[PDB]
Paper text:
Here, we take a structural approach to assess the relatedness of these eukaryotic-like proteins in Asgard archaea, the closest known prokaryotic relatives to eukaryotes. Asgard archaea roadblock, longin and TRAPPC3 domain-containing proteins form dimers similar to those found in the eukaryotic TRAPP and Ragulator complexes. Here, we adopted an X-ray crystallography approach to compare the structures of a potential Asgard Rab small GTPase, several RBs and two TRAPPC3 proteins to their eukaryotic counterparts, with a focus on Thor and MKD1. We conclude that the emergence of these protein architectures predated eukaryogenesis, however further adaptations occurred in proto-eukaryotes to allow these proteins to regulate distinct internal membranes.
The proteins (Thor-RB and MKD1-RB) were purified, crystallized and their structures were elucidated via X-ray crystallography to 2.14 and 2.69 Å, respectively. Both proteins are homodimers formed from protomers comprised of 5-stranded β-sheets sandwiched between a single α-helix (formed between strands 2 and 3) and a pair of α-helices (formed from the N- and C-termini). We compared the structural similarities of Thor-RB and MKD1-RB with MglBs and eukaryotic RB proteins. Both proteins displayed approximately similar levels of homology with the RB proteins M. xanthus MglB and H. Sapiens LAMTOR2, matching ~110 residues with an RMSD of 1.5–1.6 Å. Lower levels of homology were seen in comparison with longin domains (86–94 residues, RMSD of 2.5-3.0 Å) and profilins (96–102 residues, RMSD of 1.7–2.7 Å). These homologies indicate that the RB fold is highly conserved between all domains of life and that the profilin and longin domains share a core structure with RB. Despite the similarity in structures, Thor-RB and MKD1-RB display different surface charge distributions. MKD1-RB has a basic patch on the same face as observed for MglB, which in the case of MglB, is used to recruit the MglA/MglB complex to membranes. Thus, we hypothesize that MKD1-RB may be a membrane-interacting module, whereas Thor-RB, which lacks the basic patch, may be a scaffold protein for protein:protein interactions.
Residue numbers in the entry:
A (entry chain D), B (entry chain A): 0 to 115
Amino acid sequence: PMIEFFQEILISLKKIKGIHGSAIIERYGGIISSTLPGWVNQELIAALATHILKISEKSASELNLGTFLDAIIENERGKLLFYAIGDKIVSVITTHDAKLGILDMKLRAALEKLKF
Amino acid sequence: PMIEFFQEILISLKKIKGIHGSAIIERYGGIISSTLPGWVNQELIAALATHILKISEKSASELNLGTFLDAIIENERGKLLFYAIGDKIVSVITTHDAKLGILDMKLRAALEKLKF
Ligand SMILES: [Zn+2]
Ligand SMILES: [Zn+2]
Ligand SMILES: [Zn+2]
Ligand SMILES: [Zn+2]
Ligand SMILES: [Zn+2]
Ligand SMILES: [Zn+2]
Ligand SMILES: [Zn+2]
Ligand SMILES: [Zn+2]
């Protein structure tokens, strides 16, 4: 029921152009629902999402920047986004062609349905 | 001579809207040139930059994403941008209100002068 609500949200992200896949990860935990395309190791993305959350939140605590919102990793052949929404981490893998500004605005509008 | 050229690059970053400061960090872990304000702990930013590079490079190769370009941490009261330009990491601390789109675009334009 709750996992089926997570799935229909990861499907809504598919309309956004540039997205290969996405995943709902528990805070400092494992993957709850996935859409990643298969050439992606899910346990690798999960370990990356918890390592960034731990890195970003500790440094945000000492730099007086407040609470962690989201992280972006731009590589030459793809991008890695990690959104902290409520109790979850939303990892998203994109193309290199994707424009970060439109991409970030499109994800933030669709991920508001994950606030409850 | 070279620290003069480095400092002049960081000063041109001040023209972009929302930039608090920036620093040139060697991938080894030492700050070469810095325009960061007094409230920022520079030893922390250098440790943050080298670890994020370590994680973003280790993940990009295992996920076949190519070479690491830049990493962005969006927080409640600020942003942390880390750009990999050649042998060096360019840390940038900005305001939360700064638009990520026009800031990422102007930054890459001003940081092209770092390739020689
Ligand atoms: Zn795909
Ligand atoms: Zn770490
Ligand atoms: Zn791709
Ligand atoms: Zn609730
Ligand atoms: Zn300032
Ligand atoms: Zn680590
Ligand atoms: Zn600020
Ligand atoms: Zn040269």
